[PDB]
Design a binder for this molecule. Structure first.
Ligand SMILES: [Ca+2]
Ligand SMILES: [Ca+2]
Length: 686
């Protein structure tokens, strides 16, 4: 099927996502509304249920509100049954309207709809070429106090109606009991509770298996993507085995939320997007876009540097989900803010690299501060706002112009208030000019583009004061004045003759799994796919057409490979690197080592004989290990994803700067479980 098909669950760069808080969008079924203290039909107490549900989203797909705007994916609240309690937090009553306070991951939240209503949403969305992404929040259940078992539902977890356990008297240790996090360290935010939420214990085999069985159920119901909540607050090692479960079963686009503030760049955040098997909400993009287009705390050179630097820091930048606001930020549009600021930021996001997400009601110019004020009911379903028309015009270009879906980004002209960038993929081009100064026109002289000669009409039709671009010989444009607040988009598409890979999904899986390679110029006839120097041809290529190849991963050693395609004529593509072939199915094992004393700056790491443990290379060793919450120094511990059902060999080592101290003695061996978790508890061997 083509790369733009709704059946492409692996890659979303050709899509535009509309993020919906289900409760705040449309009440299509009043009979499923909560009653009593849990409900507020006027939606003026923003912490109660207002009534929005899955029938309301079905109605807005059917009547053309969502499809008229060019939306091709919706991202909805977690679908799972939540606690029914109205919790009073110092006078204010609070309900689970947001879907984050789960009690049974195998059932539906009835305020949103039945399981038949969820299937009707999936089938209605897919009949209209809309993909469905769901939130999934496996870090916790709901508010709980083990001291007071009567508070809320005591964090209880059920498995399809059957109670597994509560937070008080947790004799099976389904939950963590280390107190609440102060967010001082990543280790501290993982194993301690976020606020009062009962933290799930993923080292318990019952919890591990239950959450993996629950996500497969939702994949079986046909969801096309998953947004994982609180990825900074769960063990990396457990999240990599969770991703391997999804990818080796039914791979779908998965991304997580790791918040970053203004000007914060975190190595760990980049490491997680590059190695977990999931991508991330692009906070680095969002925060700089708000600084340049909203708050005016940086200028176009800051925008340029973010686009140039993130193309490099993210190993797969086309998989990062971009946005200008969402449920964890104040709405971009302010009361005294020019609406043109919101319209340009949306045009910038829709034509930029990655997977664009628009927070519901942006097209209706909703303003509001932080939670819960950024989650009001949307006030109007008017299809004639300028912002609705901007999305309507630009969102289709992700499906039709591969330079917007996959292309590189090149700044062609800039000054403090103007940027003109080009997106390029093969011979497909898009050029975008934006002037954020609302008072001053900009004289553009010397603009050179990759556009063929012609008179290109603004795709926005002049609604944000854009103009025609006349391109002469050698891509040189005739000089023009860019209007105050002007934004224009010019483009040119054609066929690729050379294979060019724009995106691959999933990026981590074991041998035998089918991966999806998207791009242009592959040809109709079946060619060759290279994983390193290994050629995959013939029947192992499940499908080949010009924009998409589906191929089985060859039985190669675990490790990281470059992918390259050669069409039937032997013309080869660009390399798409960093593909991780796993040794096999994964399980998370907790490694615990006692009596490992260290100097300042020296930490303990683990390596071993499989790719998942870095294949004996100290530079790729797992760590640094933790030593504060579950176990305390000089005992160190870490949860590591490791191949299931086999004997691995390993050693611990201490590293400080460039010095590696290996423990002495013979290599350690351990036979891993086939499912569930395991703990290895050993003593440092001098
Ligand atoms: Ca309802
Ligand atoms: Ca946690």
């Amino acid at each position: 099927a083509p790369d733009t098909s709704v059946s492409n669950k692996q890659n979303f760069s050709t899509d535009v996502i509309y993020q919906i808080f289900t409760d705040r969008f449309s009440d299509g079924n009043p009979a499923n509304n909560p009653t009593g203290a849990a409900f507020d039909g006027s939606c003026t107490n923003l912490r109660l249920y207002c009534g929005g549900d899955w029938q309301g989203i079905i109605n807005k797909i059917n009547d053309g509100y969502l499809t008229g705007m060019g939306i091709t994916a919706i991202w909805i609240s977690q679908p799972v049954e939540n606690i029914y309690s109205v919790i009073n937090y110092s006078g204010v009553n609070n309900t689970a309207y947001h879907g984050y306070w789960a009690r049974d991951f195998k059932k539906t939240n009835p305020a949103y709809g039945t399981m038949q209503d969820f299937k009707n949403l999936i089938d209605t969305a897919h009949a209209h070429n809309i993909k469905v992404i769901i939130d999934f929040a496996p870090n916790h259940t709901s508010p709980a106090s083990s001291d007071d078992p009567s508070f809320a539902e005591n964090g209880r977890l059920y498995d399809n109606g059957n109670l597994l356990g509560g937070y008080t008297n947790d004799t099976q240790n389904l939950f963590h009991h280390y107190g609440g996090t102060d967010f001082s360290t990543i280790e501290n935010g993982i194993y301690k509770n976020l606020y009062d939420l009962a933290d799930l214990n993923h080292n318990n085999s019952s919890v591990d298996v239950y959450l993996k069985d629950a996500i497969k159920m939702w994949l079986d119901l046909g969801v096309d993507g998953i947004r994982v909540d609180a990825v900074k607050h769960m063990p990396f090692g457990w999240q990599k085995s969770f991703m391997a479960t999804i990818n080796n079963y039914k791979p779908v686009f998965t991304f997580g939320e790791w918040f970053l503030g203004v000007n914060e760049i975190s190595p760990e955040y980049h490491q997680f997007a590059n190695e977990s098997g999931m991508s991330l909400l692009d906070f680095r993009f969002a925060q700089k876009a708000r600084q340049v287009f909203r708050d005016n705390t940086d200028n176009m050179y800051g925008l340029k540097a973010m686009l140039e630097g993130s193309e490099v820091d993210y190993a797969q930048v086309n998989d990062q989900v971009t946005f200008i606001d969402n449920h964890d930020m104040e709405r971009f549009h302010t009361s005294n803010g020019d609406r043109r600021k919101l319209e340009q930021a949306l045009a910038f996001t829709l034509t930029s690299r990655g997977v664009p997400a628009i927070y519901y009601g942006s097209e209706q110019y909703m303003s509001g501060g932080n939670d819960p004020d950024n989650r009001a009911r949307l006030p109007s379903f008017s299809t004639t706002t300028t912002a609705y028309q901007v999305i309507q015009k630009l969102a289709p270009l992700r499906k039709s112009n591969p330079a917007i879906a996959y292309g590189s980004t090149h700044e062609r002209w800039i000054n403090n208030d103007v940027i003109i960038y080009e997106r390029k993929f093969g011979n497909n081009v898009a050029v975008v000019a934006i002037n954020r100064n609302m008072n001053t026109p900009a004289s553009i002289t010397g603009l050179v583009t990759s556009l063929p000669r012609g008179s290109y009409n603004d795709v926005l039709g002049g609604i944000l004061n854009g103009n025609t671009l006349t391109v002469g010989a050698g891509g040189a444009a005739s000089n023009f004045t860019l209007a105050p607040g002007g934004t224009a988009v010019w483009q040119y598409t054609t066929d690729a003759t050379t294979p060019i890979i724009g995106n691959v999904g999933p990026m981590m899986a074991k041998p035998g799994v089918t991966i999806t390679i998207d791009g242009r110029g592959f040809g109709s006839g079946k060619g060759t796919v290279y994983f390193g120097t290994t050629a995959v041809t013939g029947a192992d290529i499940v499908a080949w057409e010009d924009t998409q190849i589906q191929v089985k991963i060859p039985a190669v050693p675990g490790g990281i490979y470059d992918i390259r395609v050669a069409n039937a004529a032997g013309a080869a593509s660009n390399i798409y690197d960093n593909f991780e072939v796993l040794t096999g199915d994964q399980v998370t094992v907790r490694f615990v080592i006692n009596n490992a004393t260290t100097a300042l700056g020296q930490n303990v790491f683990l390596t071993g004989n499989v790719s998942e443990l870095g294949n004996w290379d100290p530079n790729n060793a797992i760590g640094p290990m933790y030593n504060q919450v579950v176990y305390q120094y000089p005992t160190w511990y870490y949860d590591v994803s490791v191949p299931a059902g086999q004997t691995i060999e390993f050693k611990f080592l201490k590293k400080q700067g460039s010095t590696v101290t290996w423990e002495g003695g013979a290599n350690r061996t351990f036979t891993t479980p086939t499912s569930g978790t395991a703990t290895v508890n050993v003593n440092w061997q001098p």
